[PDB]
Amino acid sequence: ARGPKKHLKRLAAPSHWMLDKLSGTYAPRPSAGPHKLRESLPLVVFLRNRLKYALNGREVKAIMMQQHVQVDGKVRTDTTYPAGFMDVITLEATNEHFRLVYDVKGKFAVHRISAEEAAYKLGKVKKVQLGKKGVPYVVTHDGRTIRYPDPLIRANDTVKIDLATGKIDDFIKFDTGRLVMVTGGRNLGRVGVIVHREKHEGGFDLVHIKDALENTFVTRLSNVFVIGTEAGKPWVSLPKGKGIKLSISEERDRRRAQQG
Amino acid sequence: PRAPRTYSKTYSVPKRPYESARLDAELKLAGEYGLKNKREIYRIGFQLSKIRRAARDLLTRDEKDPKRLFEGNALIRRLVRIGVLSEDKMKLDYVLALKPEDFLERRLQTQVFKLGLARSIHHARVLITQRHIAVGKQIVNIPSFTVRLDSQKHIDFAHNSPYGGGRAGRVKRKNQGK
Amino acid sequence: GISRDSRHKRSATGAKRAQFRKKRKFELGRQPANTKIGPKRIHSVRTRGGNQKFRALRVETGNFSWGSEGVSRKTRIAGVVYHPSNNELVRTNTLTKSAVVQIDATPFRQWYENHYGATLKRSRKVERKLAARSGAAAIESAVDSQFGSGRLYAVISSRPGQSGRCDGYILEGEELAFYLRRLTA
RNA sequence: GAUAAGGGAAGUCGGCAAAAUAGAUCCGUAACUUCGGGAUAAGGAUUGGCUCUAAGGAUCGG
RNA sequence: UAUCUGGUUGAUCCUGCCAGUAGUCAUAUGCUUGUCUCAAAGAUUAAGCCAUGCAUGUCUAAGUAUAAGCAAUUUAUACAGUGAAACUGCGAAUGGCUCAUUAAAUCAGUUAUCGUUUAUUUGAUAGUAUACUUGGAUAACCGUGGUAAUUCUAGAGCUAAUACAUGCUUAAAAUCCCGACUGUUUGGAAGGGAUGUAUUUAUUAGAGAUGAUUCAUAAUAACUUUUCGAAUCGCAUGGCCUUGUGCUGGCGAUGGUUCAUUCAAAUUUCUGCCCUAUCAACUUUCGAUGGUAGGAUAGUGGCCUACCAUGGUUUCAACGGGUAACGGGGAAUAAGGGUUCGAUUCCGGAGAGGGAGCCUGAGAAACGGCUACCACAUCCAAGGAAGGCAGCAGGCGCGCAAAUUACCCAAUCCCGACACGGGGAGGUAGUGACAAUAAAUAACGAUACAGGUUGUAAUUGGAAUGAGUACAAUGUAAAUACCUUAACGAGGAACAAUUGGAGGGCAAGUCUGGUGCCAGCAGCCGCGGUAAUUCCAGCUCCAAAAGCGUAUAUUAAAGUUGUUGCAGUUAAAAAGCUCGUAGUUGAACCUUGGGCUUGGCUGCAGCCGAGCCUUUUUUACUUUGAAAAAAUUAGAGUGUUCAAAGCAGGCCUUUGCUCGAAUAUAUUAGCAUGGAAUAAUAGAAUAGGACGUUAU
RNA sequence: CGGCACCUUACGAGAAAUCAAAGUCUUUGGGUUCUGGGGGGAGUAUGGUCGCAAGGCUGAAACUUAAAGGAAUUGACGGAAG
RNA sequence: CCCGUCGCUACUACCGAUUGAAUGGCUUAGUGAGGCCUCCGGAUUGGCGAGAAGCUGGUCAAACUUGGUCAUUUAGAGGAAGUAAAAGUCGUAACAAGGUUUCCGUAGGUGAACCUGCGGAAGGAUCAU
């Protein structure tokens, strides 16, 4: 109606932000950016609701206006900047590096990483095509455009971005046996290897994935993210739980043993 | 606006208002437990009716059903924890056999009277309401407080209460100060 | 104003539809350019997204292509001789797309004679280059005959009310024979 | 035999006399009905001149 | 709790309704009201009308400062700090409100854009064949004003830009076209043009991407009232000497073309809406269905135009009419199946008195924008001018029916040039028995009696406490309240519980007085004519209780709407009788049995799965899966002191460690998938039939 | 074999009278058409349609009402029989 | 026990001359504001260009008048009903073989119930000679 919306009602916010109902009428509307609104995590949510460094939105803005927060090695001062999957957030004042990777419960884990691993990131190739003057380029899942990619790189592949020069270190071809994290649907956050890709021309290709505990699930290729060349060899540190889904009874047993 | 806040009723009235058998059973049960009104009996019947409904729903499922095992064990565990269900009756078939007196046994007022801290059940209610009784190190003035098994041994007079080592109350201080 | 919405129409079953909402700006139309022939007059139109369209109200020349020869030249437009949509556009000389027009033949005749040497003082190398291009210099009779009148048949390919250009290609082959039959009748 | 400001039957037994309408094309047409009508009901639009365009045929030739 | 009870009769069994009964996130109203938490609230009738005030503004070192503003002399005589007014930029298209319109419309789920536009964010992307830096306007400002009146503005004099309008600076080649001359068997060439990117055609790659393209991209020939390839701003001030205002260069602001991305938008596939036939034919003049060409649009499309066909929908309910109809998530009630509701905390749509047309802009057919008409309506000096509360508060009116013209940006978020400003968005308090949670109005002894070692009935004591009041601290932007807490604060503990009833249904009097078929009661049956169990009262008792009653609607009861699941001989109801189209429904029959090996799970058997050997076309249905917003529902965990809730929280007390924020359900349609019973469908009958994998 | 019926019984049904269908219906599902939803107002008014007409077919509502009705029992009565 | 005219009171709906009346939507025709596009125009204002008022023709089209239609309310002399109230007048149609068995369809007649003809039914007063 006459133009873009600028507000986000609290109840209409993505559920994986884990916002409380009664704290207010509105929720942080993520800005336009590398990641989609529904699949992002604004820095205000990360710094106040997750890390609890800031006590309120005034404080998260005070933190970010002092140039502390970096996303993918670049300073961001937008409190609603849409950080997303595989993004690296650096707070060198506290000497902390985080990567936004889904945990098996469907949420963005607070996943601390070493400084050496915080120097790169992975990106799922969305499309490969030719730019002006016949220069090929790759579009990753976070909207990055890398020119002159390896001519072997195709869609659904994973590239390793140097994240300081923006170049491609090396890549992983999408194929059977590759380590995968699921980035959408009800299997979001699970980690396994590709068992069989079932093609459907004009429809949605389906990928069969086997967990490390030999559990098999099916998910859309659009929800499939290659993160490693084989089982047990991920190119990034996995969050606690290793993307292994436990039943609610198993979780209850594990909590009973963990707590006594 | 802000998201709505949930609320719900905790009782339900009988369909037939005047029935001597139910009226006599209710009055006998209220007299036994020193209850204020019939609504405190309706509340027990309501929550037992929905405990039974949940157990019946799980009992229609096959044994070894993941949902029956998970929610049945949780419901049994909760009832054993609050002392309503005995430790040798953890079968989800004795849950259906539960009765409102099992729940009224576990009220704070009943436990205060049965621990000897009060002369009668009506003394128990006024002791609770007048902030004399503490569970653990926390004062509880709600008579319907359902006492847990781990809380059973920690029911005693408040440390700052006249009956529990505190200073003398208003009346005594006014009498001995004149 | 002019609206392109489908709400005002009656359904495929014939039912009249009730009025759903007021006319929206994202479904507007505008008025035809009705491009004529005369000294160039072009008005810009501010379109959706801040983009620009050009109403050619009057044009004299255009870019016309000789497809077989692979050559394009800017030449005057003489008049409109045939229009498959409405004969009143022929009568009033209104330039739209797919209008059959007569274009000045001189730039193409000049290119042809300079390129091949025939009609419709040189060095030895130039004469040899022309001799090499010979044999391919024989064009269709129906096209050759027009050069006597100095005017070639062409069809407008651009949309003058959209781009301000009145461009086209020279009629050839059975398409030229087709419109020749249409013209003679 | 014509015309007439403003009003428009107040004239008169009574709209007597006069006025108004009027051809053609297209649109639209009520009650009632013996289903045949009523009906040109009622009520509307157009119409010149000029320059064009289109459609509608005959006899011969396989 | 899968429940019934009273009323037809002299009595009986039925049919059957009336009446009773319970709930309502269901409204109003009557009576009553002590505490804590939570909280709806001018929807219904009038999308009726509105006084007044507020609800949208906005500046960083980084666009423009000669304020004749303030401030200090300082690294500064171009400016330098702060900073009104103005120009410029951006926002004002979000939010908030309401539900009038709207019945294949909206909407829901599911699709598409190889059918488009897209400010902004985020990535990439431009060496292209006067320069030590171009012009002339204008505002603010000064001072002359005109009008009764407005956020009206007019002459005149200044002056700026990231405003406006123009304009150079550059690699190395190489390629193509014309081509004087020349070689002279077809080569060499001087000299001219053209190369980036945008636009528009025509002709060529495209034998890297897609399921698929005339896709991406490139090339050739041109075209263009020629797009833009920085005449901008802040901080640092470095390096090389050929010490000349020499040559070079660091972090940033802002901007810019195209592509991508993101926020969106616009169209769009399939299936699905309540009552009505006392609506059976509708659409097609003057677009109805389709074809061709064009115009227009951001783009597809009868969206519009011209020409041409005569199509398109319909008893499988079209079209018309009604709706006290915005749709959905949901709500009430619920054994199951259902019935009813959804103006209203979220999503989509629509509107801003009724229509219509536009400007600006990326985005509006915007109304706290404009223009005009209609209806209302304000000031007027009578010439004119200004309006739009279905935003917040408030008023009138309407009515059965709904609150303060309060405080604040502290939180949630949004907007802006932005760490700073603004926000009736939002939050806070006020009113508030809409609903919901918890929960006081007393407890315990001794005598005296009655009584069978203890339950009371009275007159005698000493304890206890919060309702209330208050220092104070906390809470809070500041308060209020809550939570804590000195001192005060209970015997008739007058610190006094009410609303309905006492014939039956239906729990509780055959007490006393009054009246006397009156007055009245009574949902229904009935009561009242002088001992009224029913009226009016006193006493007593009963039910629920800070709540209780009444009216209306709705749900259960209702197997009195019946698919589950009614009835039709006589209680209502088999068409007078046959035919008959749609619809519904339709006999049986086609791989069964046997054998061997093996995996798993239940306690030798049993139950599922397999794998071989035995001659070995279309659906419907059902399984599983993918994708399916939150809130609500169910449900796991968790001592909000309990609870309704909430999504918290827990650890020996932590310059930190640490479980969490589950899980189900949705269900028609679509998508993918396993199975082949059941029910359809097709095949080889004038053979135009099937196989020849390597038949000729 | 087909009909028109009848007699007995009640497995069964039914409120009963009664019923070989009015059975195989809470142990509720062979196929299908029509009709009813307390008594009146009322098969009335209105609209339509058919008919020459008489009328047929389709067909309400306001309002009103606690019964109307079915089968059977005992009695009372009968210008009914014995 | 009971039916129907007739009489009194009250209520509800109906018909009805009045080409009755009022309110709202849609629409033919006529008239037609305003914006937008277009066509010229050319106050004045820069060095040929910019350009205001206005003009031509279109386009979208509010709004008014008439007519038509749809929909919702409403007056009416008089006419003709229904129900409630009381059991007022006249009779006695039904319930018994109700004293002429009753009822159905149809058609006449009549203060009223009703009577009569024709053909049916038993729900008969006969399951039978």
Ligand SMILES: CC[C@H]1CN2CCc3cc(OC)c(OC)cc3[C@@H]2C[C@@H]1C[C@H]1NCCc2cc(O)c(OC)cc21
């Ligand atoms: C010279 C002829 C005319 C002269 N004008 C002068 C103007 C005038 C004006 C009038 O009024 C404006 C008018 O009123 C009638 C009459 C006249 C006379 C009438 C006369 C002819 C007429 N004479 C009497 C009858 C008659 C019969 C006929 O057959 C016939 O045919 C030839 C003609 C006649």
Ligand SMILES: [Mg+2]
């Ligand atoms: Mg909005």
Ligand SMILES: [Mg+2]
């Ligand atoms: Mg696709």
Ligand SMILES: [Mg+2]
């Ligand atoms: Mg006159």
Ligand SMILES: [Mg+2]
């Ligand atoms: Mg006159």
Ligand SMILES: [Mg+2]
């Ligand atoms: Mg007149």
Ligand SMILES: [Mg+2]
């Ligand atoms: Mg007269």
Ligand SMILES: [Mg+2]
């Ligand atoms: Mg007269």
Ligand SMILES: [Mg+2]
């Ligand atoms: Mg006279």
Ligand SMILES: [Mg+2]
């Ligand atoms: Mg007279």
Ligand SMILES: [Mg+2]
């Ligand atoms: Mg006459």
Ligand SMILES: [Mg+2]
């Ligand atoms: Mg006429």
Ligand SMILES: [Mg+2]
């Ligand atoms: Mg009776």
Ligand SMILES: [Mg+2]
């Ligand atoms: Mg309202």
Ligand SMILES: [Mg+2]
């Ligand atoms: Mg409201």
Ligand SMILES: [Mg+2]
């Ligand atoms: Mg309404």
